[PDB]
Design a protein around this ligand. Structure first.
Ligand SMILES: *C/C=C(C)/C=C/C=C(C)/C=C/C1=C(C)CCCC1(C)C
Ligand SMILES: CCCCCCCC/C=C/CCCCCCCC(=O)O
Ligand SMILES: CCCCCCCC/C=C\CCCCCCCC(=O)O
Ligand SMILES: CCCCCCCC/C=C\CCCCCCCC(=O)O
Ligand SMILES: CCCCCCCC/C=C\CCCCCCCC(=O)O
Ligand SMILES: CCCCCCCC/C=C\CCCCCCCC(=O)O
Ligand SMILES: [Cl-]
Ligand SMILES: [Cl-]
Length: 264
């Protein structure tokens, strides 16, 4: 059902995809240890935002590791190229994982925005429903990336509608609650918005690769885009979320945060 299955791969193509996925694992588990260790410097009100980065790191790291082993299981070097064996490789599993990781990314943002109570629960609920709409409709569309490109486009448009509405919820909350934020993080949080707009848009671009580059180099491009997108949307984003948490914590008087920021 997926374009990866259509092609044989050069050793270069195959080894590059393997290295991209493997590097992805390493970056996410490296960042995991950073988040774990810095969490002690985060005030209770925010500490779950840092814990969510740990959860996203393992989740994304495990999907990348899964993809990497599936890639090596699926292909063997036969008659001068890597050819499909009995097991299959697919990006479908990333979609399933987004059902968990996207809500985690959105919740960590709501936490540092100082939302709480009813507003937090209601905002999270609408964001998660929009996210799930996006992800499910996209998952369905990509089943057609070989057999019916028109269907892939239409499901893609539906998904993009959910995306745009989600992004409008996010920006609305960010630009409304920016003024509650401490320690100068009212400025930092605007950069977080733009980082999300940029990084998250890489996913629909990857989605469309079967429409504009249906060949083995397109397969490579798609994995490359997911790699850039994962690192930006999870790791760089989590690092900014954690900086914001620690800075707000120190401004609120949490002494471990003040001491951590002091000794750097
Ligand atoms: C860490 C993983 C992240 C942030 C994943 C984000 C995924 C998206 C923003 C996906 C969006 C899509 C569209 C807007 C249209 C095409 C189908 C999807 C699901 C790829
Ligand atoms: C936020 C940035 C994240 C960067 C992650 C990506 C790093 C890897 C960069 C690779 C550059 C391209 C290498 C050349 C491709 C060879 C093509 C081939 O034969 O398949
Ligand atoms: C197994 C694959 C290769 C091993 C990867 C190990 C190298 C890790 C490099 C970067 C990971 C990013 C983690 C960011 C932590 C904070 C960075 C910082 O404080 O500047
Ligand atoms: C990776 C494996 C070793 C990591 C163990 C880190 C312990 C952190 C302790 C702490 O921050 O309280
Ligand atoms: C809530 C979901 C809304 C879905 C709208 C339907 C448009 C996509 C259906 C395409 C079906 C088809 O191409 O046969
Ligand atoms: C070359 C350009 C690549 C730059 C990639 C960005 C890498 C890491 C940024 C992590 C976020 C750091 C927190 C912001 C600190 C602050 O606002 O003072
Ligand atoms: Cl607190
Ligand atoms: Cl993920």
């Amino acid at each position: 059902k997926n374009i990866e299955s259509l092609f044989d791969y050069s050793a270069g193509q195959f080894e590059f995809i393997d290295h991209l996925l493997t590097m992805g694992v390493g970056v996410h588990f490296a960042a995991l240890i950073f988040f774990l260790v810095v969490s002690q410097f985060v005030a209770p009100k925010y500490r779950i935002a840092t814990a969510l980065s740990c959860i996203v790191m393992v989740s994304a790291g495990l999907i990348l590791n899964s993809q990497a082993v599936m890639w090596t299981d699926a292909y063997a070097y036969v008659d001068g190229s890597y050819q499909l064996q009995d097991l299959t490789f697919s990006n479908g599993y990333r979609y399933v994982n987004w059902m968990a990781t996207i809500p985690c990314l959105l919740l960590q943002l709501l936490i540092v925005l100082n939302l709480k109570g009813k507003e937090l629960f209601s905002t999270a609920t609408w964001l998660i429903l929009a996210a799930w709409g996006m992800i499910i409709t996209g998952y369905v569309g990509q089943l057609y990336e070989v057999d019916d490109i028109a269907q892939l486009m239409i499901w893609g448009a539906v998904s993009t509608a959910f995306f745009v509405v989600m992004n409008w919820i996010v920006g609305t909350k960010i630009f409304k609650n920016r003024a509650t934020m401490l320690g100068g993080t009212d400025s930092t949080i605007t950069k977080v918005f733009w980082l999300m707009m940029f990084a998250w848009t890489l996913y629909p671009i990857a989605y469309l690769v079967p429409a504009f580059m249906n060949n083995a180099d397109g397969v490579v491009l798609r994995q490359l885009l997911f790699t850039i997108a994962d690192i930006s949307s999870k790791v760089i984003y989590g690092l900014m979320i954690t900086y914001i948490a620690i800075q707000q914590s120190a401004a609120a008087g949490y002494v471990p945060a003040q001491q951590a920021l002091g000794r750097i």
